[PDB]
Amino acid sequence: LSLTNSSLMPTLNPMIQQLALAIAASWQSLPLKPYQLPEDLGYVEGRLEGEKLVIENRCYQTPQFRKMHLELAKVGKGLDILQCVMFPEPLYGLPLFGCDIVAGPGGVSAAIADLSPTQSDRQLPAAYQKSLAELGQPEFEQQRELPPWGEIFSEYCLFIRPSNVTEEERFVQRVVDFLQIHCHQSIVAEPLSEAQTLEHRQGQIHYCQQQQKNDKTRRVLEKAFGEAWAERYMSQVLFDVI
Ligand SMILES: C=CC1=C(C)/C(=C/c2[nH]c(/C=C3N=C(/C=C4\NC(=O)C(C)=C4C=C)C(C)=C\3CCC(=O)O)c(CCC(=O)O)c2C)NC1=O
């Protein structure tokens, strides 16, 4: 988690670097243990007929979070990516923290962050609704509309092209705020009933199945590794259906 031994970090877009540091800082004092990905994956690289894709995978778990996954990636010299999902243990009924950042030489093209629901009513728990409302509406100049599979995201989801450094920093601060809320709620959550645990598990499964519809990720993986590898990666490493 120190990221001090990351080979990608020094070379990534500055907003991605700050967000990776913020996520690692939020996690570093939790009761973590490593989470072994399929084939105990860590670093991976591949190329076919075009650019090389390199990915650093870090993955942890705690009693409240089944899987805490931070990926950093680069395609060639032209494209940097940060992905993070905290998959909740359904027993505690927490939402799914996620973010995705994509940047080119011209700057960040896409910045997405959310606390996504797992309840059948598609609502965040009441305490999250209350704390999120208290943050107020952030202003961003270049909003982007989610694709249809993005129905899984909450009404608090951010999806923008940052317009300037002020917006990059506002976005990172909102992600910090989401993580502060989420980590706090993880302390004040208890084991749920078996029926409720089941309901939350179903919400998480749905989230993973919808994330697998994102062809933006799939094409990048396929161009470097091919169709079969990408399908394994997306279904077994990124968005495993529990
Ligand atoms: C190896 C990993 C990985 C790759 C290759 C990847 C690529 C990637 N994700 C993107 C978009 C996106 N990414 C997401 C969201 C997410 N995506 C997620 O993995 C998570 C957890 C969320 C949300 C919490 C959304 C909503 C888009 C826009 C999709 C679209 O425009 O169709 C884009 C398009 C950027 C743009 O339109 O400006 C690329 C190239 N993202 C990655 O994470």
Domain at 170, CATH number: 3.40.1500.20
Start-to-end CA span in the chain (Å): 25
Report the Cα 162 to chain-centroid distance in Å.
18
User: What's this structure's resolution in Å?
Assistant: 1.3
Number of separate domains in the chain: 1
Tokens linked to 67: 């899987």
Q: Is the CB of 56 under 6 A from ligand 1?
A: no
Within 10 Å of residue 228's Cβ, how many Cβ atoms?
Answer: 9
Q: Which of 32, 12, 30, 31 is nearest to 21 (CA)?
A: 12
107 vs 86: CA distance, rounded Å: 26
CA of 153 to the centre of ligand 1 (A): 13
**Domain region containing 117:** 1-242
Q: Judge whether 58 and 70 are in contact, CB under 8 Å.
A: yes
214 vs 62: CA distance, rounded Å: 28
Q: Judge whether 111 and 146 are in contact, CB under 8 Å.
A: no
> Which residues fall within 8 angstroms of residue 183, CB to CB, at 6 or more apart?
26, 30
> What DSSP assignment string belongs to the chain?
---TT-SSGGGS-HHHHHHHHHHHHHHTTS--EE---GGG--EEEE-SSS--EEEEEEEEE-SSEEEEEEEEEEETTTEEEEEEEEEEPGGGT--EEEEEEEEETTEEEEEEEEEE--STTS---HHHHHHHHTT-PPP-SSB-PPPGGGGGS-TT-EEE---SHHHHHHHHHHHHHHHHHHHHHHHH-----HHHHHHHHHHHHHHHHHHTT-HHHHHHHHHHH-HHHHHHIIIIIIS---
- Please, which experimental method was used? X-ray
Report the sign of the C-alpha dihedral through residues 28, 237, 102, 45, in that order.
positive
Q: Is the CB of 71 under 6 A from ligand 1?
A: yes
Which residue from 83, 143, 158 has its CB within 8 A of the most atoms of ligand 1, so it is best to mutate? 83
